[PDB]
Amino acid sequence: SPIPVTIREHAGTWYSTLPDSTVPIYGKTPVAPANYMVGEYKDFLEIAQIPTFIGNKVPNAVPYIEASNTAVKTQPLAVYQVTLSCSCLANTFLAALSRNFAQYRGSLVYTFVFTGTAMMKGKFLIAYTPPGAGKPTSRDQAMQATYAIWDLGLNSSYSFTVPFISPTHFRMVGTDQANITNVDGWVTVWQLTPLTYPPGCPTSAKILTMVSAGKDFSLKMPISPAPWSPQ
Amino acid sequence: SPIPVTIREHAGTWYSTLPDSTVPIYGKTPVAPANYMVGEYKDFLEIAQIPTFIGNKVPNAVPYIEASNTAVKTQPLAVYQVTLSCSCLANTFLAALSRNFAQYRGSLVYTFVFTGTAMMKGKFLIAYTPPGAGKPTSRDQAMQATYAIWDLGLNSSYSFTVPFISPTHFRMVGTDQANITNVDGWVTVWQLTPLTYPPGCPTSAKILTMVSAGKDFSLKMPISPAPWSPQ
Amino acid sequence: SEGNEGVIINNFYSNQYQNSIDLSANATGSDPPKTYGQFSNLLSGAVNAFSNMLPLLA
Amino acid sequence: GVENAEKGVTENTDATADFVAQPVYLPENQTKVAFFYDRSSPIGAFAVKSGSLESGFAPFSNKACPNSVILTPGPQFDPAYDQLRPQRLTEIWGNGNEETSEVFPLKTKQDYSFCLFSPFVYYKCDLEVTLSPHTSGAHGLLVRWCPTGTPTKPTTQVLHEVSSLSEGRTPQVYSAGPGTSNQISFVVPYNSPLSVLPAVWYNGHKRFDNTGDLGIAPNSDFGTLFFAGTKPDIKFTVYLRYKNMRVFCPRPTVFFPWPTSGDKIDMT
Amino acid sequence: GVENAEKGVTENTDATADFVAQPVYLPENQTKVAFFYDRSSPIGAFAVKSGSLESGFAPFSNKACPNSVILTPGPQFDPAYDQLRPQRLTEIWGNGNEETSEVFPLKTKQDYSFCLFSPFVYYKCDLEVTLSPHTSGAHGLLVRWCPTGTPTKPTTQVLHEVSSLSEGRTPQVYSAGPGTSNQISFVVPYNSPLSVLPAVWYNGHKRFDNTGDLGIAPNSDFGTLFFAGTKPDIKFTVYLRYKNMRVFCPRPTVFFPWPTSGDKIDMT
Amino acid sequence: GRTPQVYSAGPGTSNQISFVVPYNSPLSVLPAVWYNGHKRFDNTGDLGIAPNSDF
C-alpha cells in the first residue's frame, strides 16, 4: 500500500522560474482591506502607450529639437534610429520597459509638440526609411520613403507612426555589440519650408519630442538587461 | 496525510530515450507564426520513395553504366548486391535513411534511364537472383530467376522492382563484418541484344542508375550507424 | 504524428507551459483589442453645452 | 495625425491613421504584471555564525554576509554595521566608498532588478523565499521568520543547549540531513498593517515628532529572517519571488546613462 | 514497368507491377520524423571555472571544455579561442590540425548525429536539455539560460559574494546537495524571432552591408547556457532532445565514403 | 548517437539500474536451446546458434 515511485534524474534541482508554488507556512492570515485603492494597472502595455521624452543632443540631452528659419534639404533636424536601443530613447518608459523583454512587434509613435510662438508658421517633412540602402542624406531621398508633412497652425502637436516593416514577425529588442547601418531604419525630421515670422518674434522655436507604443505594439519573453549604474 | 512512497531501486537514473517529458522553465511563450510555410513532410517513408543515384565503378563513382555494341552472355553490365550496405548504394538517400534503422522489409526499386541517342536500339535482361546457389555467372543462369526484358524505344526509363523474398518477415539493414556470398542475392544487368545504330552515331551509351523504396518498403527501430567522416 | 512520449497521466504542467504556443498570423493583419486593461487618465470638460451661456461671443 | 499633447492625453494609433497600412496585432501574455514579477531574483549572500545551532543568537556578518535579513526588495544593510542588526536604507552602497573604489558588486542587500524596474508607487503581493547554500555537501540551516512589526531580538536563549532562534511558536524552519537537497523554500503571507506598500519612496516620517527622515514607511516589509546552522563557512543566496503582484499608480523608473559613445547600446 | 524519369517524378511500385506477386506491407511508426528526433544525443563536454559560484563569470574552458554553450545542433567552439566566448561555426574541426593529426574526437561542439543525418532545409522544435556530471559524488551546478538574441555577457557581479550568473530575472537553475541525483533536466521553448530555422545552411549574410560571410542566419539558435559550480574538476556532458520536431523541404545528407574495399560496409 | 544510453551517477541514487527492452530479433520466435543450422548458405558448418537470436 505505500506507492512505488521512480525518482527522476533531475531530483533536487531548483528552477528560478518554475511554473509552480511552494510550501505555505503561515496560513489563514487575513489581510488589511485595500479596497479603497485606485490607479491599478495590470499589463505594462496599458501604460507603454503614454509618451515620454526623447533625449536630443546626447549626452547633454534636452527634450526637444530646434526649428530654424532655414530649410537646408541637406540637413535633418533630427535622425533617430528605429531601435529600442537608440541612445536617443534610453530614458523613455518605452525603452525602459522594452529592455526587460527579448522581442517586440508593432507600431512606434513619435510625437512632436510645437512650442514656438503663435505667430510662427512652418512645415516639416517627417520620414521613416526602411533599411537596405542606408540612411537618406537629403530630404529629397527621405521623401522617397514613408513620410508625412506637418503644417503648423492651431493644433500644437503631430503624432507620426512608424509602420512595422519587417521580414520577421518580431524584431529583437536590444543590440548585442552595436547594429551598424542596420537597426531597422531611420526616422528623419526635415524642414520643408522655413519657420517664418513677423517682426517682434523670435526666429527659432523648440519642438518637444516624445515616443510611445502604438495600439499594435507587443513585447515578449521577459529577461533582464545587462545591469547598470545610473552614475 | 503526506503520502507514503516506496522508492524503486533504479532511483536517480537518466534514460536517453524515456517516453516522457521534463520540467518546463519558460512557459506561456508564444511563437512566431510559421503558417506561410510549405514543403513539410512527416514520415521518412514519404521521401524514401524518391530515386537517387547508384554509384558505379567505385571509388571512381559515376551515376551510370555503359551499354556496348556487344552482347557477351558472360559479362554483366552491372551486378549489385541486394543489401542496403552495398558500397554501390552508399550515397543514395535510401541507404543514408536506412542506416539509422535496424531492419527493413519490402520492395527495392532500381530505375534505369537510357541516355544514349534516339537512333540507338537495344534490349537488356535485368534479373534478381535470391541467394542459395551463389551469383549467376551468365545471362543464361540469371534468366532462371526473376527477370525482365527492357526494350529501348520512345519511353526513356525502366523501373525494375526486386521482390522481397525472405524467410524472415524482416531483414537486417546493415552488415556486421561483410556478408560473404550472402547478403540477399543479386541484381544483374545483361545485354540481350547489342546496342545497334546507324552510321553517324556513337557506338555506346550511358544508362543512369537510381534506387528508391517501393510502396511496400518499411524500416523499424531507430539507432545510429557507426560514426564516420566523409573525408 | 507524435514523438516518443507514452505516459497515461495527463501532463502535470498545462500545455501553455509545457509547450511553446503556436500562433497563426493572418495576411491582412489583426486589430488590437480596444483596451489593454482598465487603467486610464481621463479628460473631462473637453467640449461644451451648458454654462452662463450665450452672453459668450459669436 | 494632428494632435494636441497639452491635454495630458494623446490618442493612440497604428500605421493605419496616416498611411495605407494594416494593424499587426498578435497576442501575448508575458507583459502582465503578475507574470512579470512571478519569478525569483536574488537579494544577496548571507552567513550563519559558528555554533549558532546551540546558543544565543547575535547579529553578525561573515563578509558583509550577515545573519538575518529583512524581507523586502529595497536596500538594507549598511556595510558600516555589518555587525549590527541590519536596517532598511534609502540608498544603495557601492562596493567601495572612495573614487578609486568600484560600484559593483554592491555591498548593501536588495533586489537590484526590482529597484532598476518598478514603475509603480504602491504594490501588494505574497513573498516566496528560496535559501540556496553555496555547497553540494551536507548543510544544516535553522530559520526563524518573524512577521513585520513583531519581536525581532531573538537574543535570549531560553532552553539549555537549544538555539535561541528555535524558541516559541514563531515559525521556524529547519533542514539538516545527509539526504536533503540542501535548499529551503516557503511562502509567507502579507503582514504589513499597511493596505498597500510604498515601492520606491514614502514621503513621510516615522513619528509625529517629524524627527525628519523621510523615505520609508514603517512596517512596510514582509518581516525578518534569522539564520543559525552548521556550516559557518558556507554562504547561501536568498531569493525573493512576488506571488500575485498588484501595482498602483505608474511612476518613473531608474535613469539610464547617455551613451557618450554611439546611437545605441547593447549589454554590460 | 516502363517509365520516363525525365518528368522529375516516378510512379512507385511493388513487386506486383511486373511479376506475379503480392504487396507485403506491415505498419510501423518509428519512421515519423517527430519520433525519430525525440531522443537525446550529446553535443560535447563542458566545465565550470573555479569559484564561479561566488564571483564574476568569465569565458573559460578546461580542455576545450568550456564554460557556456550555444543551444544548437550545429558546430560551434573553434578550439583556437577556447578562452573566448564560443561561437557558431560553419565547419567542424578535427581533433588535430595537421596531416599527422586525427579526425576523432572532434574538438568543436555539435550534434554529430543530427549533422550526419538532417535531410531537410528548415525545422522548428522545442529543446529538451540534459546536463550530466561525470561524477557519482556530490556536484553543484548553477545554470543561466538566456533566450537567443538577449544579453549574453553575464560578466558584472552585482551582488557581493553571489555568482554573476545568478543575477536578474533571467532563468537560473541550480542543483547542489548531498541527496541530489546530480543531473539536471529542463525544456526551453522556441525563441528565435525566425519562423523556422535553417537546419544546415543559410545562404545570406549577417548585415545588409553584405560583409560577406554566408552560412548562418542570425538568432537561429535556442539561446546560450552559462555554467558555474563547485566541482571545477568534473566535466559534464550536455545532451539535446528535439521536442515536437517539424521539418520542411527535403535536401541531401552527408556524404559517405566509397568502400575502396568491398561491395558492402559494416560498422566503425 | 541516438542509440539508447542509460546513466545513473549521483550521491543520492540507489545505485541499481532497471529497464525493459522490446523483442528485436528479426526472427519470429527464438531457438531456446539449439538451432540445427549454419550461419551462411556456405554451410561453413558450425551448427547451434541462429543468427540475431538474442535481445
From Swiss-Prot, chains A, B:
Domain of life: Viruses
Disulfide bonds: 86-88
Residues of the full protein shown: 394 to 624 of 2293
Protein name per UniProt: Capsid protein VP3
Function of the molecule: Forms an icosahedral capsid of pseudo T=3 symmetry with capsid proteins VP2 and VP3. Together they form an icosahedral capsid composed of 60 copies of each VP1, VP2, and VP3, with a diameter of approximately 300 Angstroms. VP4 lies on the inner surface of the protein shell formed by VP1, VP2 and VP3. All the three latter proteins contain a beta-sheet structure called beta-barrel jelly roll. VP1 is situated at the 12 fivefold axes, whereas VP2 and VP3 are located at the quasi-sixfold axes.
Signal peptide span: none
Subcellular localization: Virion; Host cytoplasm
Swiss-Prot record, chain C:
Superkingdom: Viruses
Post-translational modification: Myristoylation is required during RNA encapsidation and formation of the mature virus particle.
Binding site for RNA: 14, 16, 18, 21
Transmembrane segments: none
Role played: Lies on the inner surface of the capsid shell. After binding to the host receptor, the capsid undergoes conformational changes. Capsid protein VP4 is released, capsid protein VP1 N-terminus is externalized, and together, they shape a pore in the host membrane through which the viral genome is translocated into the host cell cytoplasm. After genome has been released, the channel shrinks.
Protein name per the record: Capsid protein VP4
Residue numbers of the full-length protein present here: 80 to 137 of 2293
Curated annotation (Swiss-Prot), chains D, E:
Domain of life: Viruses
Location in or out of the cell: Virion; Host cytoplasm
Function: Forms an icosahedral capsid of pseudo T=3 symmetry with capsid proteins VP2 and VP3. Together they form an icosahedral capsid composed of 60 copies of each VP1, VP2, and VP3, with a diameter of approximately 300 Angstroms. VP4 lies on the inner surface of the protein shell formed by VP1, VP2 and VP3. All the three latter proteins contain a beta-sheet structure called beta-barrel jelly roll. VP1 is situated at the 12 fivefold axes, whereas VP2 and VP3 are located at the quasi-sixfold axes.
Protein name per its UniProtKB record: Capsid protein VP1
Organism the protein comes from: Mengo encephalomyocarditis virus
